[PDB]
Amino acid sequence: HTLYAPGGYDIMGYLIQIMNRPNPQVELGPVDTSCALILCDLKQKDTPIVYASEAFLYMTGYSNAEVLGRNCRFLQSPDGMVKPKSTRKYVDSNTINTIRKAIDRNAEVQVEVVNFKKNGQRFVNFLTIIPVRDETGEYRYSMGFQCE
């Protein structure tokens, strides 16, 4: 059965994997459940978000139906309109390249980035993205760790 994971993903399992991941690159610190986190599909074009907890939804002001299927970059514009390769007027291009390259290289990244909520409120997001290997060792997803 899958009664304890209606979201569709064993988030507890990927967090455990990260906790014990060999040679931890960035310092994650304490994550439990109430943490604002999301999971993206690396095996799907533009790494769409395939799971958004809560906390994350509450924080960003977005619903589960508003974020699932989209790339987390929409949080970079006060109107949630962020196209790939484009130039953000309020977010450091440098920062996002660090995130971009780390992701393509399956490398860990931890930065501070300017994000925006649905209503348009700006805020600093202490983000960290750690790739996740599936049952077979291949990196199929990436877990997102957001914090205001």
Ligand X SMILES: *[C@@]12=NC3=[C]C([C])=C([C])[C]=C3N([C][C]([O])[C]([O])[C]([O])[C]OP([O])(=O)OP([O])(=O)O[C][C]3O[C](N4[C]=NC5=C4N=[C]N=C5[N])[C]([O])[C]3[O])C1=NC(=O)[N]C2=O
Residues forming contacts to ligand X in the complex (CB under 6 A) are 38, 40, 47, 71-73, 75-76, 84-88, 93, 96-97, 99-100, 103, 113, 115, 125, 127, 129, 142-144, 146
Q: Has 100 been labeled as part of a binding site?
A: yes
- Min dist CB 113 to ligand X, Å, is 5
Nearest to 141 by CA among 37, 57, 67: 37
Query: For residue 49, what are the CA distances in angstroms to 45, 89, 92, 122?
Result: 11, 24, 22, 21
Could you give the CA distance from residue 140 to residue 85 in angstroms, rounded to a whole number? 23
- Please identify, using beta-carbon distances, which residue of 16 and 46 lies nearer to a second copy: 16
- Please identify, using beta-carbon distances, which residue of 27 and 79 lies nearer to a second copy: 27
The verdict on 4 binding a second copy (CB under 8 A) reads yes
Nearest to 34 by CA among 12, 49, 19: 12
Query: Out of 21, 41, 44, 54, which residue is the one contacting a second copy (CB under 8 A)?
Result: 54
Bridge-based pairing state of the strands 139-145 and 49-52: unpaired
Q: Which of a second copy, ligand X, none has residue 130 at its interface (CB below 5 to 8 Å by kind)?
A: none
Structure tokens at 15: 């967090």
Nearest to 107 by CA among 139, 62, 77: 139
Dmax over CA atoms of the chain, in Å, equals 47
Within 10 Å of residue 77's Cβ, how many Cβ atoms?
19
The verdict on 125 binding a second copy (CB under 8 A) reads no
Q: Has 93 been labeled as part of a binding site?
A: no
Binding residues for FMN: 71, 73, 76, 88, 100, 115, 125, 146
- Which residues here bind a second copy, judged by CB under 8 A? 1-13, 15-16, 19-20, 27-35, 37, 51, 53-55, 126, 128, 145, 147
